[PDB]
Design a protein around this ligand. Structure first.
Ligand SMILES: C[C@]12CC[C@H]3[C@@H](CCC4=CC(=O)CC[C@@]43C)[C@@H]1CC[C@@H]2O
Ligand SMILES: C[C@]12CC[C@H]3[C@@H](CCC4=CC(=O)CC[C@@]43C)[C@@H]1CC[C@@H]2O
Lengths: 192, 194
């Protein structure tokens, strides 16, 4: 029952050509099946992409003392896996570099926005649990903190991919995370 | 001259269709000129892209005017203000971050973008060196890491704003981000050489 084989074929084709220029025919041909066999498992490009997104989010929550400490470990492990896990590597490379916000990709981009709001929620919860445990201040502007966290991580990923991986992510990621963590805990500009 | 018209028509077409699906024919059509009149001024899509990037880079370098590290603060704030208020800068950076897939077809356009990145990396290194000499930044500052820190911090704000459909106020967020980032460059020990 390996609907996993069809996902990995879409991942390879999205990786090689981008999402806009990938056709269902290509994915089926790459997965070595008929259009009909592909269709029984995934109606169209969006559901392939949604399912890869789900696989990524599931790997993250699997790998999951203290809530704020766990969060630190989650961000660190994320950038490790970006380097050592080929699916995580190729998926985020697609998300940041091969997903033009065109009207051809409108439904893929709605999918991505859907997981963005899930992730915003998981962050808002971590921030609230951290306020309660006294890791963050009570006047933490949580809404700007969520933007702050997402921008920081997005910028490192975007920088690393868009530069052709020209720097050592294993050296650089802990320092970016270390700084961002310190700012959330201490910087006045992140409060109301 | 007439180069200006052709360049705006390229920018609109890149913003509508992205760089990869834009044709030189369409740009000519959009601009009201024959294919041969365009080719005279711009030999290919890459030349148009390069022209637009230079004009953006020229705009920023023009708007330069206590202490040059505090000037850096200003030009950074002016960048994010221009992004929200200037149509060419908004469209151009939208195309750069959202409509420029890294396929084999765009590789020449990406090379052009990497060339302007390197110009900007050296411009950042020079601002950091002046600020060290001035002692706005510790002489101990790790300049290589700091440049990646600066680009990654700023890139992340831009990516976040464009890819989320501009669902937050850049005018209020960007000054906070810039203030934190510059605080970290002066004070955070993670940005020193040891
Ligand atoms: C930054 C990001 C959204 C937020 C994600 C992040 C990956 C790590 C992470 C895991 C969580 O448990 C909370 C959300 C975060 C913090 C994602 C990587 C790309 C995406 O834009
Ligand atoms: C971050 C960035 C490179 C560095 C640029 C930045 C725009 C603002 C800017 C102006 C300068 O004076 C130096 C370089 C910087 C700081 C660019 C926006 C996109 C690009 O990736």
């Amino acid at each position: 029952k390996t609907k996993e084989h069809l996902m990995l074929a879409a991942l390879e084709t999205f990786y090689r050509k981008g999402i806009a220029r990938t056709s269902l025919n290509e994915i089926a041909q790459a997965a070595g099946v008929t259009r009909g066999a592909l269709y029984w498992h995934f109606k169209n490009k969006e559901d392939l992409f949604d399912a890869l997104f789900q696989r990524i989010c599931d790997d993250i929550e699997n790998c999951i003392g203290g809530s704020w400490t766990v969060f630190r470990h989650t961000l660190l492990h994320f950038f490790e896996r970006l380097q050592s896990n080929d699916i995580h590597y190729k998926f985020h490379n697609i998300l940041f570099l091969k997903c033009e916000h065109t009207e051809q990709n409108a439904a893929v981009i709605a999918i991505a926005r859907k997981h963005q709001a899930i992730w915003r929620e998981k962050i808002t919860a971590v921030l609230t649990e951290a306020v309660e445990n006294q890791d963050l201040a009570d006047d933490l502007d949580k809404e700007t903190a969520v933007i702050f966290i997402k921008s920081t991580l997005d910028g490192l990923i975007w920088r690393w991919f868009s530069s052709g991986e020209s720097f050592d992510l294993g050296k650089t990621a802990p320092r970016i995370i270390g700084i961002m963590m310190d700012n959330l805990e201490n910087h006045p500009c992140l409060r109301r």
